[PDB]
Amino acid sequence: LPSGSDPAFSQPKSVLDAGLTCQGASPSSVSKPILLVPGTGTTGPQSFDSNWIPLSTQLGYTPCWISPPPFMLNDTQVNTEYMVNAITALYAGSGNNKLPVLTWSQGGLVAQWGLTFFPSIRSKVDRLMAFAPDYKGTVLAGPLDALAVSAPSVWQQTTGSALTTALRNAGGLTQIVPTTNLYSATDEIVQPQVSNSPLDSSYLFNGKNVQAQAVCGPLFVIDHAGSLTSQFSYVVGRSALRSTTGQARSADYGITDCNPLPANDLTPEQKVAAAALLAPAAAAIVAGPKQNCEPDLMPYARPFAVGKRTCSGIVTP
Ligand SMILES: *[C@@H]1O[C@H](CO)[C@@H](O[C@@H]2O[C@H](CO)[C@@H](O)[C@H](O)[C@H]2NC(C)=O)[C@H](O)[C@H]1NC(C)=O
């Protein structure tokens, strides 16, 4: 795993600062913050307004989020800078206290990419609660890449990409901070997710990998968005956030919790929105940038994906 000093940011600090926002507070003076890293094709609010923003508030946290432009569709390496900058700011803004990081979809990949290549944040992140993370990308994006209808981050989240290869070879497939991965075998966006073993895209060695079906049975069905908004997910997430170990405890949830519908504590209005979470994301992807090649890896990541091909050609150290 990489060690030492953090790589330089490619973006100006003021640009990175503009992507961070906290509910009812400034990042420089926030109490018990929680960083929410959104999914592909959405902004912080679009990913969490109907779920984890109000739910984390009810848990005693001040929700904060990053909204990398445009809609998390650009280079994942850049989206991560927003997160690293956010952590640095929220940590100092909370009296130098570690803070939890909750994520959805691509947001998990960004968190892990950050913990792997940016050593400084490893002592600033308390725990990681990842919902439907795609550390190994997804095989379902291959076809889209071939037609060149994929955004920069879709190329990178494709199984076999230079980005996912660089993460694996750098040792990013092992948890770096206490991590809880809640996913579903019936995820229509991320695959493979059916083996309930290291082959799954949301699996991290030494982490609390929770495949919903392994707990609720083969008849339990929650999709990509469901992995984030379901009552089952709220219970597992609450467990992860409260745990003294930093990971979700099996003793905190059981079959009773196997409710595929949105979290009970959500207002009926928030429930309807949470059920249609994927709608805005699909819209953003249809209207967003599209290209015919995977974005070039930044210098700090090239040594780990030699031989792979990106927009400029073959990768060399
Ligand atoms: C989207 O990602 C690209 C690729 O990382 C960013 O472009 C780079 O930006 C830096 C800083 O401005 C430049 O020094 C590089 O030359 C750019 N590279 C390329 C290939 O364009 C871009 O800034 C990001 N845009 C947004 C809105 O996040």
UniProtKB/Swiss-Prot annotation:
Active site: residue positions: S105, D187, H224
Enzyme class of the recorded protein, top EC level: hydrolase
Positions annotated as glycosylated: N74
EC number(s) on file: 3.1.1.3
Catalyzed reactions: a triacylglycerol + H2O = a diacylglycerol + a fatty acid + H(+)
UniProt keyword Metal-binding, yes or no: no
Keywords: Cleavage on pair of basic residues, Disulfide bond, Glycoprotein, Hydrolase, Lipid degradation, Lipid metabolism, Signal, Zymogen
Cystines in this chain: C22-C64, C216-C258, C293-C311
One Gene Ontology MF term: triacylglycerol lipase activity
GO terms, biological process: lipid catabolic process
Primary role: Hydrolysis of triglycerides. Is very stereospecific both in hydrolysis and in organic synthesis and has a potentially important application in glucolipid synthesis.
Protein name: Lipase B
